[PDB]
Amino acid sequence: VNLRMSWWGGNGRHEVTLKALEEFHKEHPNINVKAEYTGWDGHLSRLTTQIAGGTEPDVMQTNWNWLPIFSKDGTGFYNLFSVKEQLDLAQFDPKELQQTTVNGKLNGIPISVTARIFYFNDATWAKAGLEYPKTWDELLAAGQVFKEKLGDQYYPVVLEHQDTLALIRSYMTQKYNIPTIDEANKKFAYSPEQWVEFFTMYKTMVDNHVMPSTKYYASFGKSNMYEMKPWNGEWAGTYMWNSTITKYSDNLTKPAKLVLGPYPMLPGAKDAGLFFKPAQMLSIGKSTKHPQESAMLINFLLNSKEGVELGLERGVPLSATAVTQLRASGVIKDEDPSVAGLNMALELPHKMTTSPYFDDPQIVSLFGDAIQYIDYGQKTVQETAEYFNKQGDRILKRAMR
Numbered sequence: 001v002n003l004r005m006s007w008w009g010g011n012g013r014h015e016v017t018l019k020a021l022e023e024f025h026k027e028h029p030n031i032n033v034k035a036e037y038t039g040w041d042g043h044l045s046r047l048t049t050q051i052a053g054g055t056e057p058d059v060m061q062t063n064w065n066w067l068p069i070f071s072k073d074g075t076g077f078y079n080l081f082s083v084k085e086q087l088d089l090a091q092f093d094p095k096e097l098q099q100t101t102v103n104g105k106l107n108g109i110p111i112s113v114t115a116r117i118f119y120f121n122d123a124t125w126a127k128a129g130l131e132y133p134k135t136w137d138e139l140l141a142a143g144q145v146f147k148e149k150l151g152d153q154y155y156p157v158v159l160e161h162q163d164t165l166a167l168i169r170s171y172m173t174q175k176y177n178i179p180t181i182d183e184a185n186k187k188f189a190y191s192p193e194q195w196v197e198f199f200t201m202y203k204t205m206v207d208n209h210v211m212p213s214t215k216y217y218a219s220f221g222k223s224n225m226y227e228m229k230p231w232n233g234e235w236a237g238t239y240m241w242n243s244t245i246t247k248y249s250d251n252l253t254k255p256a257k258l259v260l261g262p263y264p265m266l267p268g269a270k271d272a273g274l275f276f277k278p279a280q281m282l283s284i285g286k287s288t289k290h291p292q293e294s295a296m297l298i299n300f301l302l303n304s305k306e307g308v309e310l311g312l313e314r315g316v317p318l319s320a321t322a323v324t325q326l327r328a329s330g331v332i333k334d335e336d337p338s339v340a341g342l343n344m345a346l347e348l349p350h351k352m353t354t355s356p357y358f359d360d361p362q363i364v365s366l367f368g369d370a371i372q373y374i375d376y377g378q379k380t381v382q383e384t385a386e387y388f389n390k391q392g393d394r395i396l397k398r399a400m401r
Contacts (some may be wrong), residue, residue: 004034004057006036006097008284016310017313020307031293037263058285059285059288059298063280063281065360072104072399074102076286078284078287088321092318095351096110111279116170116239116345127150135265139156140210154236155236157211158230159212160225171201173352177351179352188392199388214226214371226248237261243342282298316332371384
């Protein structure tokens, strides 16, 4: 049995991957793996040619957005439910697998995921004399306290349009317990009025000093957010991916740092309204003359003692046994606020999962546009709500096709 595995990464990744494949082959002398690794540059292009002409590898490292690219109907990759006997699926939360399932077909297993949560500048919150918010109302209320007590340059948080998207959406899910995207009907699922409440919520936050408006943000801003001067502790936190937080925290003015915050909840909410994003995945090529061996390879990499021991080269593993192992071997920390942030999100009550079309960059860019028309007085909240509804449904209609 001669299998092909592709991936992209840098030398570190290639080394630990090549090492894991020798480990696999030791335990499976009959199964050989042709490794087809490159850097990220041109990877998508080489893979696109292979998948389209049916010549892709048995096992591929893939991105979540490869589901929109290659598997809009679920058939672009081999359905992993077909090989559930080689693959210990119970290691991966079914919430997680739902996000890599298209029309009932399991298209990928997430290697690791990241979630957005709050982190705060402790020194600045200490000066505000405020606890971190437990509710949306306390978040709102923090705007006015920062403004009045510390001064007008001070904001509880700073949000780039993408963080705001995810944040107001989380509020919507907590309130309504409803998917943002209707996948059956390939469109946004909010009613007209919910979109107005969405954008009205954004205007409320900005009007109440909770974060910089896009105009105020732009006025500094040729840069990475954490390299901006107000990020002197004037912008006192962030709604951000756990797996990138250290860079943000490190550019603070010591002894100041980022502390993991509470997750704001509506009283009685049963669903925190989270956004877990697969950092990457493993997929079986719709082409494989060897589906079961390909599953054995996936299983080995994600779940086996020897395989897991891949380390954190692709981030903290999603696999429950991997996590357990890498904690026990001291490789995963607990206290490091990037690992701690993920663990907190995982453990919050949550039920709605995110469609990969929600992370479409056209969608993110549209939302950017929408908040700017607001902040620059070009559209009212209402004209913006409708514009987003409409333009967003035209993106989803094309993309989800």
